[PDB]
Amino acid sequence: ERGYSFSLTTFSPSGKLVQIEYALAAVAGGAPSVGIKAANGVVLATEKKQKSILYDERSVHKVEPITKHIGLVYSGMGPDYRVLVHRARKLAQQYYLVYQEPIPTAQLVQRVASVMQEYTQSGGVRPFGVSLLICGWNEGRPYLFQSDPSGAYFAWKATAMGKNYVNGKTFLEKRYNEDLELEDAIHTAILTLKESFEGQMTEDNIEVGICNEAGFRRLTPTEVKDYLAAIA
Amino acid sequence: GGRRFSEGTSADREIQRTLMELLNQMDGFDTLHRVKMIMATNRPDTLDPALLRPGRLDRKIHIDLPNEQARLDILKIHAGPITKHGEIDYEAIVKLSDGFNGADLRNVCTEAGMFAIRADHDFVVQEDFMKAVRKVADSKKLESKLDYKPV
């Protein structure tokens, strides 16, 4: 490059930022996803489709692990997702080289959102088009956080993103209670993902990852075929 | 026609109202019977999609210029009733021509008629056609940005 470095995101005359609001529009028209925190573990459930019978499902993965106990899904766009995965992978290593201890889940999200915000103020680039759902069972209590293209973190009990997320939002508002078990959380997570799905819900149309206090665990399609018997 | 849009210099508001009248009257609440409509243009790129939607304009059809045998057939049509001797190399006329237009091959049949009336000839020779194309070939190539981009 040359030395331009001019930020292409400035304030509106109203006083809002324009490109971040447009980046949120790309997230809302993405694949639906749901995450539920249920007092012994946290369950991530995304919704994976294939436009043909020609694609392969053992290749592209949505639920992606980070350390040994920290999972991560998204709802926005695809190529930008893999960037900040590899960024967060290295970002958890400088914690572990220095402190010799697995990084707490709150400590990642402070660092990932700091990457993402500082990315928007600098010049020549667009913001990301990805929102995240990060979870983990650190120090007894499990956790569930959500980031955004603006770079703001939250702490949900149960949220949803992607298409028709407000419909899934009201559904969890009646479905979720003070506490459940892990298996009940999986049963209501498939229930809310079956809200806006299509007719074929096989072991390949959904893709589910959990966080035990024993650790992160990604579910193979065998159990998801077995657990979808009398689903929702 | 054209596309609807936002705040648009109030002259344009009328033409959208004229267009909305046309969309309603030819296909709306009433039943248009024994009536057929032939629309013809060159820029079908940006219109109202409510105008191009089927039911009112069912089958659109594209009409292409080059076939290399059509330009042979267009040439035989326009040079049908012309006095000559049959010494007409149509293939070299077809090969050397960038006419691309039945009006242009009408113009080529006009030009070779103009050279033939020069030097007092009732018949038309093949060289008149070779002068007819080169006048056509020069007249077109003295132009720039001659775009031909539809939908």
Partner: protein
């Protein structure tokens, strides 16, 4: 909009052929009328705190 909620809660009880109304009838009635372009999303209004 108070009238619209009263009409929608009335219309929901009509199709059930019922002269009674619940609290939930109004909850789905307000959610019908509250249909705006400034969508909720939790991220439009929390990034600006």
């Amino acid at each position: 909009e108070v009238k619209g909620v009263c009409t929608e809660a009335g219309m929901y009880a009509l199709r059930e052929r019922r002269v009674h109304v619940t609290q939930e009838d109004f909850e789905m009635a307000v959610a019908k009328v509250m249909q705006k372009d400034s969508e909720k999303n939790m991220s439009i209004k929390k990034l600006w705190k």
